[PDB]
Amino acid sequence: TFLRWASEPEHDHRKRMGLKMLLMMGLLLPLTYAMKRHKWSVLKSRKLAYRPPK
Amino acid sequence: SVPETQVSILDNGLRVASEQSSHATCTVGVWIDAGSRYETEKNNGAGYFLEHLAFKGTKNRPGNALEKEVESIGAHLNAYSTREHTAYLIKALSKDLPKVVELLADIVQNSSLEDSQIEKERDVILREMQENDASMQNVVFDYLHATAFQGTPLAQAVEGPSENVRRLSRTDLTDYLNRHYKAPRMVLAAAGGVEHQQLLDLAQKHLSSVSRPCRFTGSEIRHRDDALPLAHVAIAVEGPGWANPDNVTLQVANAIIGHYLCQSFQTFNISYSDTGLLGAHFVCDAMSIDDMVFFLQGQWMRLCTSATESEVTRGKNILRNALVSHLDGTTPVCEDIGRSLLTYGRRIPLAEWESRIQEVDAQMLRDICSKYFYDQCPAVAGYGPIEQLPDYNRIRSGMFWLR
């Protein structure tokens, strides 16, 4: 355990950063996905129709 | 001291209004609260096709002998149909006032729809529609109505789809006639050299027999046809309606907007019963398309944010000078009178219009413009080479400013 600590004194600090990163990404990924799906809904609902004058 | 429009509704419900003027020529019309908004997609061209059939003879005056009568006094006979109102009006002399009223009585009741004529007027209507497509601005405004009022009876056109036109019969027409021609929904309007008591007596003599959720939708419709030389684009937002007074303020704003870039700018405030379309219909070359827009949207946001007193005063003067719409001419006034009684239920005098104009200042103009233009979803209708016409996100983002 000590040698491990030696080889990475920041082990603890990092894991705290990783926990904050997972919480922030769990907050931010569905919200950015919702913004993308808002701004892409317009097209994803676009209905095309071909009306040759005939 | 505006000449008052004396009104005399009948027990049947026929409001009879008239305004007297020096003109020895008088215009008399019948307004009916019946348009394409009252049609239920199975009779989508009934009002238009009845408007074609209404001058082709009645029971008492069979065929062209009827129009021979309106040639005999030298009178002019006109009719029109909108999405909410139908009008049958005659411009004549003053001394021919009784017979004209009698003629109008036949046109609203006792009318005769000949089966022979029905086929002939179907070919007329069909052909006109088959060539109506030629008029672009009509195509663009119909597209704007369709995409703004999808799923409602306000999307469907006055003419209707060729389908219905072909598939229509006397009985159907008879229904529309017998259903939407009720006496309480009718105004007999007269303007010019007419006496109100004589007109009331004539309405009592004839015409005394007449029987007794609107939603806007923001959507991008784009009819691309690159062979056309010019492009017509209309952008609108939801209007307030007939009875909402800030229409007056919006009219001033429309005035202030005026028309400054690519040619063919314009502005409209079309009003229906508690709804409407307020916007602009420009028409232009491939490149100007966007900028004009960009241009146009900037002006709207300026009216939402930075309206000054000088342009408000200019718009008020332009609107007042626009009261000339009322003017004194028999036809225009009569027409105005016709709507007044159908929409407001009364004739608003020009002094009340002047009071509502002079109470408008810059602060309430930018307040009402922010209420109706800022951060609103518009309806867009384009026809022609409209590839450089921006799609809905760019127009929607141009409907507000980040500053």
From Swiss-Prot, chain A:
Transmembrane domains' residue ranges: 17-37
Highest taxon of source: Eukaryota
Side of membrane Mitochondrial matrix, spans: 38-54
Localization terms from the record: Mitochondrion inner membrane
Subunit structure: Component of the ubiquinol-cytochrome c oxidoreductase (cytochrome b-c1 complex, complex III, CIII), a multisubunit enzyme composed of 11 subunits. The complex is composed of 3 respiratory subunits cytochrome b, cytochrome c1 and Rieske protein UQCRFS1, 2 core protein subunits UQCRC1/QCR1 and UQCRC2/QCR2, and 6 low-molecular weight protein subunits UQCRH/QCR6, UQCRB/QCR7, UQCRQ/QCR8, UQCR10/QCR9, UQCR11/QCR10 and subunit 9, the cleavage product of Rieske protein UQCRFS1.
Task of the protein: Component of the ubiquinol-cytochrome c oxidoreductase, a multisubunit transmembrane complex that is part of the mitochondrial electron transport chain which drives oxidative phosphorylation.
Family: Belongs to the cytochrome c family.
Record protein name field: Cytochrome c1, heme protein, mitochondrial
Entire protein: shown range: 272 to 325 of 325
UniProtKB/Swiss-Prot annotation, chain B:
Positions where Phosphothreonine occurs in the chain: 171
Subunit structure: Component of the ubiquinol-cytochrome c oxidoreductase (cytochrome b-c1 complex, complex III, CIII), a multisubunit enzyme composed of 11 subunits. The complex is composed of 3 respiratory subunits cytochrome b, cytochrome c1 and Rieske protein UQCRFS1, 2 core protein subunits UQCRC1/QCR1 and UQCRC2/QCR2, and 6 low-molecular weight protein subunits UQCRH/QCR6, UQCRB/QCR7, UQCRQ/QCR8, UQCR10/QCR9, UQCR11/QCR10 and subunit 9, the cleavage product of Rieske protein UQCRFS1.
Free-text tissue specificity from the UniProt record: Expressed in neurons and astrocytes of the cerebral cortex and hippocampus (at protein level).
Consequence of gene loss (knockout): Results in early embryonic lethality.
Membrane topology, record value: Peripheral membrane protein
One matching Pfam family: Peptidase_M16_C
Post-translational modification: Acetylation of Lys-95 is observed in liver mitochondria from fasted mice but not from fed mice.
Residues carrying N6-succinyllysine: 120
GO cellular component: mitochondrial inner membrane; mitochondrion; myelin sheath; respiratory chain complex III
GO molecular function, one term: protein-containing complex binding
Name of the featured protein: Cytochrome b-c1 complex subunit 1, mitochondrial
Compartment list: Mitochondrion inner membrane
Sequence positions bearing Phosphoserine: 169
Family membership: Belongs to the peptidase M16 family. UQCRC1/QCR1 subfamily.
Main location per the UniProt record: mitochondrion
Any one GO BP annotation for this protein: response to activity
Modified residue annotations for N6-acetyllysine: 68, 95, 120, 205
Function: Component of the ubiquinol-cytochrome c oxidoreductase, a multisubunit transmembrane complex that is part of the mitochondrial electron transport chain which drives oxidative phosphorylation.
Keywords, ordered alphabetically: Acetylation, Electron transport, Membrane, Mitochondrion, Mitochondrion inner membrane, Phosphoprotein, Respiratory chain, Transit peptide, Transport
